[PDB]
Amino acid sequence: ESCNGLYYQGSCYILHSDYQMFSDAAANCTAESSTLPNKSDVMITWLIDYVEDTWGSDGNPITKTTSDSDVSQEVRKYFCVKTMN
Q: Does the keyword Ribonucleoprotein apply?
């Protein structure tokens, strides 16, 4: 019960409200022994409402759709994911 955030499939998603360019968000999660969410793990889950528009592990914001836009100059929030237990 020590997950202060979204808990799903034995993993804890912690919200980081600071806007960051993708690389910085990625490194920040790596520093906390975590990774960014994977679009495939969250689509079709109640988590999608929280993670959409936040950095996905593939360098793109997570979206409800399965899109195909220059986003390298953008900043967004992100969730760092870590397995529980």
A: no
